[PDB]
């Protein structure tokens, strides 16, 4: 009972007809007309599981089905037998209906709906089901779907529970007047325009009702942007809901106002109330006149906001322009009536706005808010003065963790719109021989050969064995020759491909040798190894050469800068096309266009049409988007030219869309759509989101990383995905892991928050630079030196380190890579050091990762020293054109300095790979990781500054030669090095430091030696000094509770310094009197007052007999820094210092009854006396007592025992060998002479009256003697 093999379509989703009668291919969907004299028609049939099939019609008739005229249609094909009504036929035929009347009603089709609204602007419109907006052509340059400015009087979705339209590239109405439209929502929105773009419409001139509307998706135009309407004109809009990605990178010079609901709020009768929104809103303000209010903004003409709550975030590029979370410009172009400003009520946003204000962009004494609420997000904006600095405006009403309770003030959540159309697959049985076990196999082998009699399809299935992996679910397989991912059937059809990769739902494949066992011109079939099954790649082997001869010339003549290409591109003439960075790949794609277009229509469509007229449709289909085809294939080529081992993915994504299922999708069309998608979508950075718009739902895939993750299982399985990532990119990356086994084991964990894995960390969510994975992947050469370290990700330019002494080729590469390993060792040792200190379970935040970007000052090899070049954009720097620029990270870039946004670090004065830049790396780490990192989960002192925590409190010594009490955790240096002389700093950290408890021992001793010498100093002084010698020896310190602009309260005490009076000096007659007069040496200090959060540090041996502890909550800088240094030297950093510098007793202070209002919020205030007691309630009731007991304890400590083994030069260049100071009295006797000589004939002018001064020489003489004498500062007795 042998059947025959004939062409047969099994998944016949629908049949469509087009005619070339007018010289253009046009769809005769209905009212086709009585059969035409000439069969110029060609039948394209759509299949849910296969690409559309094509053939010319051979017969067409019109007969009455039940006295019901229906245009019969027939098609002649080589062997298209149809099992019609369980009866086999020879060639496919169908019957097309006469007409439909679902356009008078706009309920059914989007195309019908747009026509209906255009015949009558004023009408009542209703929707039957959720529908696709893809039905519309979109027009070459049409402004919006509806031309009419007055429309949509009553458009409603209430008839059904809910409905929405998905896939929108244009605004809906373009303008509304007296129009009520509610219950209407959209999903795959992507509206981009060079005009004032509003998602719903451009404007609402009269009162128009916009309610219970829930738009979501992408919105971004070159010129203007409003959340729903571009501007609000006397129109009621409330309970609205736009949650989408909106950005206006284009540097338009107009003062465009963008808004969450309307860019300009202009209605007096109008008002926005109880509305919701979320956004990745960002922009370059530049102009104060331009205003982004986050929630609508540009409040003007008496517009009132009724309890609206939005959760979207702002990332503004320009600090100068005005932008804020709830109001962008309260001020009016008209007169400043408290009333024309508009009103704000019950408003809270969790915007992490940058370079923008928290609540209102324009602050005026008559602010019209009165109901202010804000969330805990980032509002810090960069001042951009000489030094680059970033701070919050601190002029907003802050709220705590009851933001969810505040969210409950919002009345509604959302609606769940019914899903769009389905047109299900409906995936055979009822055959002469059917095996139920082989049913899945029949489905799996239906993929392997299409257009085969269902009987023949099952015949092949019978040949399958029980062991065959076809029994396991088999995803779409693919054919490749020597791992070339061959797509060209017309060329390698004669050629025999090495193997067929049988993809599984396991996400693994199997290899079967192919051979051209049989050749059919209708279809080419191959051998299935020894198993004996057959295999045909799906194609009709039509005459492509004729198409090839005509297509290449017209597409060949195109220009990257061509105005027509720009006209088809979604870009204005003024904007520079730099962002594409596609000019290099524009040239390459054109050079390879013939092979590129060969690989394109090789599998584009199913054509059984020997007739050449049908082939012309394909040629017409291509030229139409020739400009976009070039741009698209160029775009895809630029971003998909990386191989998994030996297999380029370019073929995998560019062609073979079926390999990951959804083979029915049109591969040629996904390219033309991706070319017209618009430069907003094609923007380099937009690749991630463009994976959502184009590469998701066409490949039936969810995430770019997910497809790439799905791809390691398919290619090079048994090799880690991060391993595929690490091996493949040209850039040098290094993931040095910490010595601690538990953290090293965590560095092993591919799981997020523990993995050192760069691929994982870039792929990780909450990483803004996840889009940096494509540009890194396609990097031409090692122009990118990269590092990975605990809770961090290093990134740098070889060209930045390029200069004379560092030749661009090999020599520069060698110094850069070696330096990267050295710095990687320096960074990871500092973090391992910080881990030993951090045992408070704050290791839950141990691996927070932030970027380390370089200056981008990419210098020549010719340049003698570091380059000062901005290298802003469009440079020949391979590093800039292939990386950093594609993942655009615009920065303030100072001529000098290194700043951080709190989520990243930046280097200009220093270099990330510079050894001195390491100290700056910790300085930025002090600025960022502190809030709850170095602190125990309590915010820094209320006044204690952000840069007051590093200059002295917590930073590496700027140099070993530099003298300041500090921890040298960052720098480890050898003992044999000449730097051993005057090292003054820890030679090796992490070895003496194995725990915070060991640090406490290290500083008690370090400060015992400091405490020993300071008393040796004062005694000599209080005892033997001339009255005039006493005047120059000392200084007095005071505290000023001055008004500060940020806080209305003036309670912040500020250390100010001045010379003590002659009468004040006569009074001092005791060492205690120095403690009582609070006067400290003026040797290393000047009377210029110290500004709060100013750069003040602790000199290594400057005597401080002052304990000026403010009854006020904040004390100042040096006193605050100094007393915290002795608090570490007494109590553990967590035990004492953290309480004194984390305002953790604020709740205790409220219990005490001390309070300060902050950000218009009644808040607690914490005082030195209050913390003096918490730390030491009964041990000492005064700071003076605490320091006094430190001293007498200290007196016995030096007196009972001190080593004799202290020998020092402290003499001129001629080396002095051994002081051998046996006892403290001998040291004091020597001290009396050295200080007396220091006070005799003092220059106290010019520079360095300290390192040159005898007292400091002697102070660092016996200090260095101790440092040399003891392996570590472990015990002095």
């Amino acid at each position: 009972t042998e059947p025959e093999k004939k062409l047969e379509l099994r998944n016949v989703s629908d049949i469509e007809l087009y005619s070339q009668t007018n010289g253009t291919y046009r769809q005769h969907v209905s009212l086709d007309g009585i059969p035409e004299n000439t069969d110029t028609y060609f039948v394209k049939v759509k299949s849910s599981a296969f690409k559309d099939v094509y053939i010319p019609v051979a017969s067409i008739t019109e007969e009455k089905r039940n006295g019901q005229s229906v245009y019969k249609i027939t098609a002649k094909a080589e062997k298209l037998q149809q099992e019609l009504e369980n009866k086999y036929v020879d060639n496919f035929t169908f019957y097309l209906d006469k007409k439909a009347k679902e356009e008078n009603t706009n309920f059914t089709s989007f195309s019908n709906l747009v026509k209906a609204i255009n015949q009558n602007p004023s009408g009542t419109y209703h929707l039957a089901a959720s529908l696709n907006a893809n039905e519309v052509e979109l027009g070459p340059d049409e402004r919006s779907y509806i031309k009419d400015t007055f429309t949509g009087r009553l458009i409603g979705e209430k008839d059904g529970k809910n409905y929405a339209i998905y896939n929108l590239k244009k605004p809906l109405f373009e303008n509304l007047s007296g129009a009520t439209v509610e219950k209407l929502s959209l999903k795959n929105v992507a509206i981009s325009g060079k005009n004032d773009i509003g998602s719903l419409a451009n404007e609402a001139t009269n009162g128009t009702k916009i309610k219970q509307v829930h738009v979501d998706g992408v919105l971004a135009g070159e010129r203007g942007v409003g959340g729903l309407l571009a501007k609000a004109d006397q129109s009621s809009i409330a309970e609205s809901s736009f949650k989408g990605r909106i950005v206006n990178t284009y540097e338009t010079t107009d003062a465009y106002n963008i808004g969450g609901l309307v860019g300009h709020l202009t209605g007096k009768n109008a008002s926005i109330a109880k509305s919701k929104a979320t956004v990745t809103i960002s922009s370059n303000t530049n102009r104060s006149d331009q205003t982004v209010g986050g929630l609508a903004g540009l409040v003007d003409q008496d517009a009132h906001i009724q309890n609206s709550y939005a959760e979207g975030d702002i990332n503004n590029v320009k600090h100068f322009g005005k932008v804020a979370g709830v109001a962008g410009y309260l001020w009016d172009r008209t007169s400043g009536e408290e009333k024309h400003a508009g009103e704000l009520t019950n408003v809270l946003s969790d915007v992490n706005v940058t370079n923008g204000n928290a609540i209102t962009g324009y602050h005026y004494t008559g602010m019209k808010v009165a109901n202010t609420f804000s969330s805990k997000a980032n509002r810090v904006f960069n001042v951009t003065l000489e030094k680059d600095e970033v701070v919050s405006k601190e002029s907003f009403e802050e709220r705590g963790t009851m933001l969810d309770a505040s969210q409950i003030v919002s009345k509604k959540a959302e609606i769940n719109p019914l899903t769009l159309p389905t047109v299900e697959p409906l995936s055979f049985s009822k055959i002469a021989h059917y095996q139920a076990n082989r049913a899945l196999v029949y489905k799996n082998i239906e993929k392997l050969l299409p257009f085969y009699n269902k009987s023949t399809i099952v015949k092949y299935g019978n040949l399958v064995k029980e062991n065959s992996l076809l029994y396991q679910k088999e995803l779409l397989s693919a054919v490749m020759m020597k791992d070339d991912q061959v797509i060209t059937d017309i060329v390698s059809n004669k050629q025999t491909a090495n193997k067929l990769l049988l993809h599984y739902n396991d996400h693994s494949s199997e290899k079967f040798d192919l051979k051209y066992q049989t050749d059919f011109a209708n279809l080419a079939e191959y051998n299935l190894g020894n198993t004996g099954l057959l295999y045909t790649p799906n194609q009709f082997l039509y005459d492509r050469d004729s198409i090839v001869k005509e297509v290449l010339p017209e597409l060949q003549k195109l220009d990257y800068q061509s105005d027509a290409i720009r006209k088809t591109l979604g870009i204005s003439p003024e904007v520079k096309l730099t962002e594409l960075y596609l000019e290099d790949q524009f040239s390459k794609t054109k050079q390879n266009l013939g092979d590129s277009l060969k690989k394109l229509l090789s599998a584009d469509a199913g054509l059984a049409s020997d007739n050449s007229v049908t082939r012309g449709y394909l040629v017409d289909k291509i030229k139409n988007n020739k400009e976009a085809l070039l741009l698209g294939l160029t775009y895809l080529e630029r971003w998909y030219n990386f191989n998994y081992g030996q297999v380029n993915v370019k073929d995998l994504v560019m062609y073979h869309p079926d390999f990951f299922g959804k083979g029915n999708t049109s591969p040629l069309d996904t390219l033309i759509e991706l070319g017209k998608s618009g430069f907003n979508n094609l923007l380099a950075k937009n690749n991630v989101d463009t994976y959502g718009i184009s590469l998701a739902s066409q490949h039936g895939a969810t995430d770019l990383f997910s497809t790439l993750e799905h791809y390691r299982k398919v290619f090079l399985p048994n090799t880690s995905n991060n391993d595929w990532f690490k091996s493949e990119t040209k850039a040098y990356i290094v993931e040095e892991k910490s010595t601690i086994e538990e953290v090293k084991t965590k560095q092993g964990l591919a799981g997020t928050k523990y993995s050192i894995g760069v691929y994982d960390r870039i792929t990780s969510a909450t990483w803004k630079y996840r889009n940096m994975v494509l540009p890194l992947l396609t990097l031409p050469e090692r122009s990118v030196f990269v590092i990975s370290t605990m809770s961090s990700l290093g990134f740098g330019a070889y060209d930045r380190y390029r200069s004379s002494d560092h030749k661009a080729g090999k020599a520069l590469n060698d110094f850069v890579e070696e330096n990267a390993r050295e710095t990687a060792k320096r960074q990871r040792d500092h973090y391992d050091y910080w881990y030993r200190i951090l045992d408070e379970q704050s290791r839950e935040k141990l691996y927070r990762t932030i970027l380390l970007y370089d200056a981008y000052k990419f210098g020549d090899d010719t340049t003698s020293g570091k380059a000062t070049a901005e290298a802003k954009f469009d440079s020949s720097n391979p590093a800039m054109k292939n990386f950093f620029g594609p993942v655009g990270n615009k920065v303030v870039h100072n001529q000098h300095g290194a700043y951080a946004t709190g989520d990243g670090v930046y280097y200009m004065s220093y270099r990330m790979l510079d050894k001195d830049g390491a100290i700056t790396y910790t300085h930025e780490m002090t600025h960022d990781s502190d809030q709850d990192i170095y602190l125990g989960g309590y915010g820094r002192r209320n006044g204690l500054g952000p840069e007051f925590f590093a200059k002295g409190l917590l930073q590496a010594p700027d140099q070993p030669s530099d003298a300041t009490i500090t921890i040298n955790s960052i720098l480890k240096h050898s003992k044999s090095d000449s730097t051993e002389g005057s090292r003054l700093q820890v030679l090796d950290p992490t070895e003496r430091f194995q725990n915070a408890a060991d640090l406490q021992n290290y500083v008690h001793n370090m400060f015992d030696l400091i405490y020993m010498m300071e008393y040796l100093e004062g005694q000599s002084i209080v005892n033997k000094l001339s009255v005039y010698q006493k005047m120059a020896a000392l200084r007095k310190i005071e505290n000023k509770y001055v008004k500060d602009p940020a806080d209305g309260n003036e309670v912040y005490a500020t250390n100010v310094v001045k010379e003590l009076t002659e009468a004040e000096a006569r009074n001092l007659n005791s060492f205690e009197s120095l403690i009582d007069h609070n006067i400290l040496s003026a040797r290393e200090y000047q009377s210029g007052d110290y500004e709060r959060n100013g750069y003040y540090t602790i000199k290594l041996f400057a005597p401080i007999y002052s304990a000026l502890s403010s009854e006020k909550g904040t004390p100042g800088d040096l006193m605050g820094r100094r007393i915290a240094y002795e608090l570490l030297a007494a109590k553990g950093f967590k035990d004492g210092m953290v309480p004194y510098i984390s305002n953790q007793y604020e709740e205790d202070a409220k219990q005490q009854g001390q309070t300060i209002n902050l950000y218009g919020k009644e808040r607690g205030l914490v005082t030195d006396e209050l913390v003096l007691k918490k730390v030491f309630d009964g041990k000492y009731k005064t700071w003076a007592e605490f320091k006094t007991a430190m001293y007498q304890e200290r007196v016995d400590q030096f007196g009972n025992l001190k080593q004799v083994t202290f020998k020092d030069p402290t003499k001129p260049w001629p080396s002095y060998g051994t002081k051998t100071i046996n006892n403290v009295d001998e040291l004091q006797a020597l001290m009396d002479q050295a200080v007396l000589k220091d006070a005799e004939g003092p220059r106290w002018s010019n520079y360095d009256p300290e390192i040159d001064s005898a007292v400091h020489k002697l102070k660092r003489a016996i200090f260095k003697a101790y440092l040399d004498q003891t392996n570590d500062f472990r015990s002095s007795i």
């Epitope: 540097e251 010079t253 107009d254 003062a255 530049n286 102009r287 104060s288 006149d289 320009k318 600090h319 100068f320 322009g321 005005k322 410009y329 001020w331 400043g336 324009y362 904006f381 204005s572 003439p573 003024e574």
Partner: antibody, heavy 119, light 107 residues
Framework: EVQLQQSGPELEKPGASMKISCKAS????????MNWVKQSNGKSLEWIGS????????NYNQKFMGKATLTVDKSSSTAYMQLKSLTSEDSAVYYC????????????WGQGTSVTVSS | EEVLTQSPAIMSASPGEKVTMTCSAS?????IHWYQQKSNTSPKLWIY???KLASGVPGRFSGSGSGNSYSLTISSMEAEDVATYYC?????????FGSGTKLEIKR
């Protein structure tokens, strides 16, 4: 109406530095962006730098990069054009501008400051 | 940088005559902003956005342009018309002024 009053005409010696100032009225000084131009008798008139008053923003021409910088005083509603390394070439009338609808002029331009430089 | 090239630098025309100036840029910008200036006086805008006329201007003054080719077209010449002109542009940074053209009477 908005009226702009630049500093009085001044003369300075070359290789020196001077600061001029434009006064503001009848408009939101801070809300409309300011601008500055140099008026050469020998050559046409040429823009130096636009200034944002509310946030003290400053955009500089490549020609005047570092030569001069822009400051502002919101309270006094009066901007400040800061000039350094003054040269005989710098000698000129100056003019503050107010940006409305993307356009610096006619509204508004100050009476003019006849800055001169001399030894 | 975008240059602006007004010509002729000086034009002599009898009252009622047709006078036009030609300015060409180094780049293409959507809008151009004209600017009349009297001799030794602060100048004022006379046209903007290529064709959008400024306030307090007579109807005779007109403007047109596209690509790198721009111009101002005044239908009739008057004594008040005798002034400098600049098609200043601010559409692209840095903002730049026209090369400079001044109307003159033909006497």
């Amino acid at each position: 109406e908005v009226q702009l009053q630049q500093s009085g005409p001044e003369l300075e010696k070359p290789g020196a530095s001077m600061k001029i100032s434009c006064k503001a009225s009848g408009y939101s000084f801070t809300g409309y962006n300011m601008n500055w131009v140099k008026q050469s008798n020998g050559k046409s008139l040429e823009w130096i730098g636009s200034i944002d008053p509310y946030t003290g923003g400053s955009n500089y021409n490549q020609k005047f990069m570092g030569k001069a910088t822009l400051t502002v005083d919101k309270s006094s509603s009066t901007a400040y054009m800061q000039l350094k390394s003054l040269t005989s070439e710098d000698s000129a009338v100056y003019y503050c501008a107010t940006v409305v609808g993307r356009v610096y002029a006619m509204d508004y331009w100050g009476q003019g400051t006849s800055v001169t430089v001399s030894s | 940088e975008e240059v602006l090239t007004q010509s002729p630098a000086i034009m002599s025309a009898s009252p009622g005559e047709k006078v036009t100036m030609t300015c060409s840029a180094s780049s293409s910008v959507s809008y151009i902003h004209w600017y009349q200036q009297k001799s030794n006086t602060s100048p004022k805008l006379w046209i903007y956005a290529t064709s959008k006329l400024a306030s307090g201007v007579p109807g005779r003054f007109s403007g047109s342009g596209s690509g790198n080719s721009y111009s101002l077209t005044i239908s009739s010449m008057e004594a008040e018309d005798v002034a400098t002109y600049y098609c200043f542009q601010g559409s692209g940074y840095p903002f730049t002024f026209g090369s400079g053209t001044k109307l003159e009477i033909k006497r």
